[PDB]
Amino acid sequence: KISLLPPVNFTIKVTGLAQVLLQWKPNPDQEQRNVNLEYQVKINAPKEDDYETRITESKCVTILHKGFSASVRTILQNDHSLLASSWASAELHAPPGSPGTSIVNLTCTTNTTEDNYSRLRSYQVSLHCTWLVGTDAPEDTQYFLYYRYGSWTEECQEYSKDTLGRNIACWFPRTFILSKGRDWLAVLVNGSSKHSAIRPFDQLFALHAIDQINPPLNVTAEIEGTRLSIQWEKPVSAFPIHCFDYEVKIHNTRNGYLQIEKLMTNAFISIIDDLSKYDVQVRAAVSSMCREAGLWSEWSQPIYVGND
Amino acid sequence: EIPTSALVKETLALLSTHRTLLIANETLRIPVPVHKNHQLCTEEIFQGIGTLESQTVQGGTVERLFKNLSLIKKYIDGQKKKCGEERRRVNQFLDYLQEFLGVMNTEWI
Amino acid sequence: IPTSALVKETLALLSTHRTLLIANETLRIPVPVHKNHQLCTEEIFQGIGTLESQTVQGGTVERLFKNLSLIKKYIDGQKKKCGEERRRVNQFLDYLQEFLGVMNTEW
Amino acid sequence: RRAEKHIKSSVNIQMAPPSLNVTKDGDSYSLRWETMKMRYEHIDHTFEIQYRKDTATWKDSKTETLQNAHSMALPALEPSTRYWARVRVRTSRTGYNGIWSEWSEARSWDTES
Amino acid sequence: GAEETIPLQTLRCYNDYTSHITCRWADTQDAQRLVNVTLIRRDLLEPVSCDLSDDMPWSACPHPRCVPRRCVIPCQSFVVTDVDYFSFQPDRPL
Numbered sequence A: 001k002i003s004l005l006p007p008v009n010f011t012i013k014v015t016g017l018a019q020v021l022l023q024w025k026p027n028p029d030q031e032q033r034n035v036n037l038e039y040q041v042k043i044n045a046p047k048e049d050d051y052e053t054r055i056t057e058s059k060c061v062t063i064l065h066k067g068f069s070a071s072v073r074t075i076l077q078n079d080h081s082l083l084a085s086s087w088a089s090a091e092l093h094a095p096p097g098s099p100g101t102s103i104v105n106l107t108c109t110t111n112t113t114e115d116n117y118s119r120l121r122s123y124q125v126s127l128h129c130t131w132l133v134g135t136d137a138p139e140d141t142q143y144f145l146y147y148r149y150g151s152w153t154e155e156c157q158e159y160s161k162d163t164l165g166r167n168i169a170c171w172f173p174r175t176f177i178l179s180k181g182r183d184w185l186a187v188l189v190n191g192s193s194k195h196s197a198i199r200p201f202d203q204l205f206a207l208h209a210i211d212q213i214n215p216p217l218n219v220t221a222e223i224e225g226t227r228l229s230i231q232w233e234k235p236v237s238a239f240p241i242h243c244f245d246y247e248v249k250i251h252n253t254r255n256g257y258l259q260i261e262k263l264m265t266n267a268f269i270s271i272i273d274d275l276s277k278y279d280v281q282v283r284a285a286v287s288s289m290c291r292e293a294g295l296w297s298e299w300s301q302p303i304y305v306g307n308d
Numbered sequence B: 001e002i003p004t005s006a007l008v009k010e011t012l013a014l015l016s017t018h019r020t021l022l023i024a025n026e027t028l029r030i031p032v033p034v035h036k037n038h039q040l041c042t043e044e045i046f047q048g049i050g051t052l053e054s055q056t057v058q059g060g061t062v063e064r065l066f067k068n069l070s071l072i073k074k075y076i077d078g079q080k081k082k083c084g085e086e087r088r089r090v091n092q093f094l095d096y097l098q099e100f101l102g103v104m105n106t107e108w109i
Numbered sequence C: 001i002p003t004s005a006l007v008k009e010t011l012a013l014l015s016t017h018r019t020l021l022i023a024n025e026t027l028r029i030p031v032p033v034h035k036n037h038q039l040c041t042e043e044i045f046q047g048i049g050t051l052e053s054q055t056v057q058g059g060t061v062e063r064l065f066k067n068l069s070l071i072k073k074y075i076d077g078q079k080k081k082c083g084e085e086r087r088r089v090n091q092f093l094d095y096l097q098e099f100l101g102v103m104n105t106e107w
Numbered sequence D: 001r002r003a004e005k006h007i008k009s010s011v012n013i014q015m016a017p018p019s020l021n022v023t024k025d026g027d028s029y030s031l032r033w034e035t036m037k038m039r040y041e042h043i044d045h046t047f048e049i050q051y052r053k054d055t056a057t058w059k060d061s062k063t064e065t066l067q068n069a070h071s072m073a074l075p076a077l078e079p080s081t082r083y084w085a086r087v088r089v090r091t092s093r094t095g096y097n098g099i100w101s102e103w104s105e106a107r108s109w110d111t112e113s
Numbered sequence E: 001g002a003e004e005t006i007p008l009q010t011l012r013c014y015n016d017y018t019s020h021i022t023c024r025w026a027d028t029q030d031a032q033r034l035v036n037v038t039l040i041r042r043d044l045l046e047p048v049s050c051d052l053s054d055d056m057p058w059s060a061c062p063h064p065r066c067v068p069r070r071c072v073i074p075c076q077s078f079v080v081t082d083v084d085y086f087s088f089q090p091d092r093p094l
């Protein structure tokens, strides 16, 4: 009987912010037939997942403030049944510290600014992260925020402070976060104190969910008899012109008529009264077509057209 | 030992050094792509590299240039192997497809 | 057939008919470890072929798979455009340096 | 050989007629029209919308062409005369063409005295 | 060349891109007394039912005794890669 045996030397090593790289090796005592062995991996905590992997290593992104627990077992894929060995598991403990001292409401926002200096990268991403101090945190807690994207890791330097000297919010003006990048952005916030240690809080932020599109600029509009034509420019972002949705808000200051028109182009044409005053505003966002739907841009500055 | 981030600079300097020693032949004819987004023709690129090594004289800086070329080919070989090392669930693969077609839209117009 | 509208409709249908594609819960599909979709489009479309081989044959899922197959034909077209051509080696080295710079900087 | 005709669904779109509503805001009037939702929201729509006095015919009706819009305000209309309006719609994005949709149901409204 | 059948010339199939295909065509009153025809659209073959309509075909008919018809084809969805084949097959065999 073909009795598959579990893999040995299964260790989980923290290789970066919110990553762990798992490694196993085939059992020396296994029968060495020409069978193409493969491996099945199970992530037990915190986000349950499982996958099939042929090589002896796999990288999984995950939050590490709640601890990590992974299981692996040798498998052999036959034509009728999936033979598997006994599960081999390893776990990564939770970091120490008194409960409730960890940070709460960690909200991170990413802007985009036009990098006019680098001839290669024209767009640059800036990060703003805010959080509230812990309930049982000591009065002299020193919180340090770290962000990581891809293989780039950095520590914050520009912070915001309350009356007690602790750190509420951080601001990265220059990040290696790609504006068109589509990888997870890991943010780790741990700290230190002379009275009681503080448990860290890491959270994987999707770039789409935290990217605040800038408002479009130069929204011009002209009367011509009874016809309005409104045009603007794409908002500053590494995504091209064709990857943005828009709406136009036209309000009449006399009667109160309001029109909202979503469109994919960059200009909108409408017919309104020739004896009323109007204001025009637009917003923008990265289309769900190009990137998963994210937060929408704020209203543009009002533009007042017509006469009353 | 070198990492996988300066081999390109090494190769670029070496190639800029020895253009005329490498384009000596006139009857030798090797393929060249025309499409943009060069990510998809690496195999043909290194096929041309192999033919060029089989023709060019292995002496001096050229030998270390071609050794560096093999070393950088190994990295793309590893990535191509990485594309099929792991097998995941249907939903994650569907999200991967959504990302793939989002790329197909933002670039690859 | 505009490929932009092709891919756009394919994504819209993929969002709409997702649950029909996760109809069952045990099949595995090739998933690249990294996030370079362009390099491993071949394995991605092999996984598409597997999903085609095992899914309810009908409805709008088979209709979405038609757009996926046409996208695969596009991918194979610009696979074949790499080879089966001509040059005097000098501009081949030009192309090689171009690719080297691209993969060094953009990756 | 069998003679067959090739018809493409993409380049032969005839959408459903829109539904036109009329709103009296303050002392002015405006027209709002809605179309049946597609499965794909990225296909553009061009709207040709006509309004005329009751004493005049549809040939002499004011016509306005709007792209992706869903409302216009109407100009100052003469008082105490019945007004009619209607709308049609067609696709206007590259890769999707067709003929105009049928005229929408005429909507009537009386301007106040 | 081959003189196209009047049903093929008068046929115009349009779409709402959501739920249905609308097709309008016509034939000749002299043609009805000898060979009845049925529209076929194609998967395998698929005859399509039709109803007599006096709403005039989208294309003019080259005979004064033309008889027009209208057909509605319900299908669930459409994509950009759809090409619909329409042919006319005599019901009785010649």
Ligand SMILES: *[C@@H]1O[C@H](CO)[C@@H](O)[C@H](O)[C@H]1NC(C)=O
Pocket (backbone or CB within 6 Å): A008, A009, A025, A028
């Ligand atoms: C596995 O762990 C054992 C621990 O006793 C060690 O001796 C061995 O070198 C490790 N590697 C392999 C391949 O067995």
Ligand SMILES: *[C@@H]1O[C@H](CO)[C@@H](O)[C@H](O)[C@H]1NC(C)=O
Pocket (backbone or CB within 6 Å): A104, A105, A132
């Ligand atoms: C955390 O965020 C939730 C979201 O509404 C809020 O209700 C709660 O008060 C926040 N907690 C702190 C400590 O800010």
Ligand SMILES: *[C@@H]1O[C@H](CO)[C@@H](O)[C@H](O)[C@H]1NC(C)=O
Pocket (backbone or CB within 6 Å): A144, A146, A188, A190, A191, A192
């Ligand atoms: C916080 O996390 C960083 C991770 O880069 C680590 O180096 C540091 O020791 C941790 N603690 C403090 C107090 O910074």
Ligand SMILES: *[C@@H]1O[C@H](CO)[C@@H](O)[C@H](O)[C@H]1NC(C)=O
Pocket (backbone or CB within 6 Å): A217, A218, A233
């Ligand atoms: C807007 O208009 C101003 C003045 O013409 C010009 O300098 C600027 O480049 C335009 N675009 C933006 C995005 O401000």
Ligand SMILES: *[C@@H]1O[C@H](CO)[C@@H](O)[C@H](O)[C@H]1NC(C)=O
Pocket (backbone or CB within 6 Å): C023, C024, C025, C026, C027, C028
């Ligand atoms: C797919 O689902 C069916 C339905 O239960 C199941 O019988 C089959 O084993 C599944 N196939 C795979 C490869 O998981």
